[PDB]
Amino acid sequence: QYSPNTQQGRTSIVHLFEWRWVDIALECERYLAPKGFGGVQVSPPNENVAIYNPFRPWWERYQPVSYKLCTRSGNEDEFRNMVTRCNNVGVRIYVDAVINHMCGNAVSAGTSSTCGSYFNPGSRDFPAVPYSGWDFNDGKCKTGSGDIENYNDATQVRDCRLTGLLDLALEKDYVRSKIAEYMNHLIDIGVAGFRLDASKHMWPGDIKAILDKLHNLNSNWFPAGSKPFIYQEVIDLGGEPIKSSDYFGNGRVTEFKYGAKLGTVIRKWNGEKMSYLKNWGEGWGFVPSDRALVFVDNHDNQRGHGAGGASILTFWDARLYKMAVGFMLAHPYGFTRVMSSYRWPRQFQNGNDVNDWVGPPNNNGVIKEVTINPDTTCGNDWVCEHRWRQIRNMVIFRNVVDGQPFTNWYDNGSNQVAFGRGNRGFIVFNNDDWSFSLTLQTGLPAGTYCDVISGDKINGNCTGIKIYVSDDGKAHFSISNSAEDPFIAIHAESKL
């Protein structure tokens, strides 16, 4: 459960948030494979409630109606087509599995679902699965409202409704089997793993009973005995009775303290500085590296819908965001996930973005195709952060330095720091309000190296900054606090 099952030498996955299957298939072939991305986290592929008020919000996909592979992203054939084409090019697919609940208890019965399946939340009837009143935790929850009212009670956090979402009785073998049937269908199609949505709201033991029913990965693409990669979404900042460590026996866990603290450090909130990142990782009270799935922002908290709240860096904060993602991709801790978003009309009223529910670019509800501009950026309001040179090049940087120790750390006691990864890579950052000009020990072999943040090594030459490393591994770096990207990264393969 702990290994991503990526191809040897590919170290990151991208969340192509709300993308259609056909666009992901194309992207696997035209960009992800050539650029060395290990895999893709896709949005929930099962049928969900179609919510028209507000108009098709992104969160309607977290309210299941059935396990039919029928959504705004595409149908079952298109889903299969995408998994096959991506796998055939070495890029894995990870499914967002929404298995803790069905839709809101207050949603109207009818056939307002993405595949036209009938459902009746009021009577707990989801015939397309099928599920009935017996498969929900209505009689097990002990709160007066039936919803989760207090997180200091670990029992109600698991048995009651997360803001009204009907809660599946996961201790029942029937329910566990319906979920396993769904996941095995996906494993046999070829997916490499799952993000278990809302894991904090499920008992570690019920999750394990479900995982025990899962198949090994498809032997047509994976070695025999391969187990699906499992990463559980557990928001564990401090102070709650539920700890992410309680889920280690099941697979990896999302480490939300990662992006939260990186954001405050990079924003320099409340006295924090980059020099403090010297012992970043377990030293900061994070989970062990081999159990961590890290990221700067995720689909929830990039729109204020989650852990970290205000300090979270997102594409809207482009200059600082690139620096944070760069630090994440160069640091040895955890398995990294890169975010890929869409633009929405933020609209802050009293500090709250009243448009945080806006769904993906669409024409009358039909999600728009990702179009590629001549300069490789995307059109139709897809931000495509994974295509930004500074990010794409750092994805490759991680691949190149995979396995190398963290060494040659330097910091000016403020916000100018640098470190290397063995003798395969080196990165320098200037987040101070003055310039950086110093000769540092890089641990790299003598030569001329292309800085992959400002440019690329394109046919024997660098299109941006060049660094010259002398025989003793020393090199001079100059970064003014006015640079569009206040950081420089060089590695074995950008060497001229």
Q: Active-site residue among 60, 135, 197, 385? A: 197
Binding mask 418-457 for ligand NAG (x = CB under 6 A): ----------------------------------------
* Residue list, annotated binding site: 100, 158, 167, 195, 201, 298, 337
Judged by CB under 6 A, does residue 496 bind ligand NAG? no
Distances 402 to 40, 281, 329, 423, 450 between C-alpha atoms, Å: 19, 17, 10, 11, 19
Q: Which of 212, 271, 460, 472 binds ligand NAG (CB under 6 A)?
A: 460
- Nearest to 236, CA basis, from 228, 248, 249: 248
The minimum distance between CB 467 and ligand NAG, in angstroms, equals 16
Q: Is 27 or 167 the residue whose CB approaches Ca ion more closely?
A: 167
Which partner, Ca ion, ligand NAG, Cl ion, none, binds residue 298 by CB below 5 to 8 Å per kind?
Cl ion
**Smaller CB distance to Ca ion: residue 201 or 257?**
201
Smallest separation, CB 137 to Ca ion (Å): 6
Q: Which does 236 bind (CB under 5 to 8 A by kind): ligand NAG, Cl ion, Ca ion, none?
A: none
Task: Pick one of ligand NAG, Ca ion, Cl ion, none as the site partner of residue 167 (Cβ within 5 to 8 A by kind).
Answer: Ca ion
Whether 370 and 465 have beta carbons less than 8 Å apart is answered as: no
What does the angle CA 200 – CA 45 – CA 395 come to, to the nearest 5 degrees? 75
Among ligand NAG, Cl ion, Ca ion, none, residue 233 binds (CB under 5-8 Å by kind): Cl ion
Q: Is 212 a catalytic residue?
A: no
* Residue 461 sits in the site that holds ligand NAG (CB under 6 A): yes
Cα 449–chain centre separation: 31
Q: Which of 159, 233, 236, 432 is catalytic?
A: 233
* Separation of alpha carbons 437 and 430, rounded Å: 10
Q: Of residues 97-116, which lie at the interface with Ca ion (CB under 5 A)?
A: 100
Q: Which does 461 bind (CB under 5 to 8 A by kind): ligand NAG, Cl ion, Ca ion, none?
A: ligand NAG
Supply the DSSP symbol for 297: -
- Choose one: 117-125, 163-171, 205-213, 363-371; the region binding Ca ion (CB under 5 A): 163-171
Best CA proximity match to 21, nearest among 109, 86, 89? 86
How many Å apart are CA 466 and CA 422, to the nearest integer? 20
DSSP three-state, residue 217: coil
CA-to-CA distance for 342 and 386, rounded, in angstroms? 12
User: Of the ranges 26-34, 171-179, 180-188, 196-204, which one interacts with Ca ion (CB under 5 A)?
Assistant: 196-204
Position 336 contacts Cl ion (CB under 5 A): no
Q: Please report the DSSP string for 327-364 in residue order.
A: HHHHS-SSEEEEEE-B-----EETTEETTTT--SSEET
Q: What are phi and psi of 463, to 5 degrees?
A: -95, 0
Choose one: 160-168, 296-304, 444-452, 470-478; the region binding Cl ion (CB under 5 A): 296-304
Interface size with ligand NAG, residues (CB under 6 A):
3
Under rule CB under 5 A, residue 200 binds Ca ion: no
DSSP state for residue 470 in the 8-state scheme: -
Radius of gyration of the chain (CA): 23
In order, the DSSP letters of 75-109 are: -HHHHHHHHHHHHTTT-EEEEEE--SEEEETTSPS
Active site residue 197: yes
Tokens representing 21 are 């299957």
Q: How far is the CB of 20 from ligand NAG (least distance, A)?
A: 40
Find the part of the chain contacting ligand NAG (CB under 6 A) among 254-262, 310-318, 381-389, 459-467: 459-467
459 binds ligand NAG (CB under 6 A): yes
* Least Å from the CB of residue 14 to Cl ion: 13
Residue found under tokens 């295509």: 387
Q: Show me where the chain is broken: residue before each gap, C-N > 2.5 A.
A: none
Binding test (CB under 5 A) with Ca ion, winner from 96, 135, 167, 197: 167
Q: Which is nearer to ligand NAG, 80 or 466 (CB)?
A: 466
The two three-digit tokens of residue 472, written as one number? 């003793």
Contacting Cl ion within 225-254 (CB under 5 A): 233, 254
**Which three-class secondary structure state does DSSP give residue 214?**
coil
Which is closer to Ca ion, CB of 102 or CB of 417? 102
Nearest distance from C-beta of residue 94 to ligand NAG, angstroms: 40
Q: How far is CA 228 from CA 212, 289, 462, in A?
A: 11, 19, 40
- Burial of residue 233 (CB within 10 Å: 0-12, 13-18, 19+) is buried
255 touching Cl ion, by CB under 5 A: no
Give min distance, CB of 85 to ligand NAG, in A.
Answer: 35
Do 37 and 10 form a contact (C-beta atoms < 8 A)? yes
Positions at the binding site for chloride: 195, 298, 337
298 belongs to the binding site for Cl ion (CB under 5 A): yes
Strands 92-97 and 457-458 come out as: unpaired
Report which residue type is found at 190: G
Residues serving a catalytic function are 197, 233
Query: Which residues contact Ca ion (rule: CB under 5 A)?
Result: 100, 158, 167, 201
